Design a binder for this molecule. Sequence first.
Ligand code: HEM
Ligand SMILES: CC(=O)[C@H]1CC[C@H]2[C@@H]3CC=C4C[C@@H](O)CC[C@]4(C)[C@H]3CC[C@]12C
Ligand SMILES: [K+]
Ligand SMILES: [Mg+2]
Length: 405
Amino acid sequence: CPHSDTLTIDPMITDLAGETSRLRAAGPLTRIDLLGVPALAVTGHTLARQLLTDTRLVKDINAWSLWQSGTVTRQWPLIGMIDVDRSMFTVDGPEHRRLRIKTTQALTRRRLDALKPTIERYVAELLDDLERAGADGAVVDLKSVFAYPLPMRVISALMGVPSEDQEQLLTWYKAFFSILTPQDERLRVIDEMHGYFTEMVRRKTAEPGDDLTSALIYATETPLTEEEVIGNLQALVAAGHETTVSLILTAVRALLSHPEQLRLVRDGEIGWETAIEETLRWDGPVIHLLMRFATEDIDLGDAVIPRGEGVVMSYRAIGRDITVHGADADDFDITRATAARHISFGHGPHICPGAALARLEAAIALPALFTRFPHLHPALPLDQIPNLPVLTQNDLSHFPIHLGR
Ligand code: HEM
Ligand SMILES: CC(=O)[C@H]1CC[C@H]2[C@@H]3CC=C4C[C@@H](O)CC[C@]4(C)[C@H]3CC[C@]12C
Ligand SMILES: [K+]
Ligand SMILES: [Mg+2]
């Protein structure tokens, strides 16, 4: 591929390793092309930290010059990632905290202790499904049987999504994230999702229960608008499911391909927690985060982000930052000193509110899985597991394993 001064993000994810390296090498700020739409990617750790706390970078899609001019529209296949309703996700400034506070309180380590038994129950249930599927030495998909359902069950328990509605949510999410979904069908799926959660908030308003959705509705003043409640709810369920599936799967893939490091955690010399942090740094759930806009020109010394320009946080490239992590940043090493120094959960006001929950689900699921099936191994070379065509998320397709004897 000849030299180009715009890096085109391939939506088929045919060369993630190469693209990620190009992005680091072109950085820490470089021009990218997202399905025919230009933007700047932040690929460097220190610069990312700076800009994530910069008040001249906002989520508001109306601050985007290409949106103002109608150059980008709802026909853009990535538009569902950013042209969404009011929530903690889209708001900046003094109003932002109000939209976050009930959620961060509900998701503190101490509050999550109450959720621990529930997580344990689902993990045990799905390991049981794994046993059944892997009987008589059969090949089994670790994603569909285990990693894919677990975080949906867990986030659904927290928010009050009924057992019987969870399959439909997963079907919608799959359509929503796949670049291949026809755009008209995707926009219809976006409407259906919104319709589902509108009704859920109406149901919880009539009949509140012991769940975060009910706590968002009834605080602990001033009360959240209906739109705000629905917006927070959609963001929490989608993010809580999609990111966490990836982290479970990549952590297993990492440890299975680095058996000496798997041994370290199994024998209690390094914490599972630490293996999870290194996974987040090295092969984490987010590839790119769309998208922020300059309210005015931002001067970075030898470079200017012009007012109205789109800014993407390229979190995977940032995790491979050689300046911060040393020359071997492209290796998985749970013993490295900077394993916990990533910003894969973000930085600043929009930092992930669910990081503790994510960490807890992984810290329960991973040891449970390897203790239950100590001889678990790939039935297909790990390096041949392809990514699903989902541009922004590190979404693995399937994960064939044998339980082992
Ligand atoms: C498990 C792995 C996870 C990773 C790698 C992850 C990563 C992130 C990152 C990087 C952001 C901020 C993007 C930015 O502003 O630049 C974020 C925001 C958010 N995340 Fe997490 N997340 C994870 C799990 C979760 C979970 C479990 C939940 C909910 C329970 C969640 C809910 C949210 C919400 C609602 C936001 C928007 C916050 C705001 O904009 O103020 N994510 N996620
Ligand atoms: C970083 C990440 O992967 C998560 C954190 C916040 C999440 C977004 C928060 C809210 C929404 C709206 C929802 O209807 C569609 C998914 C979408 C657009 C999420 C996509 C995945 C995101 C971006
Ligand atoms: K909208
Ligand atoms: Mg050039």
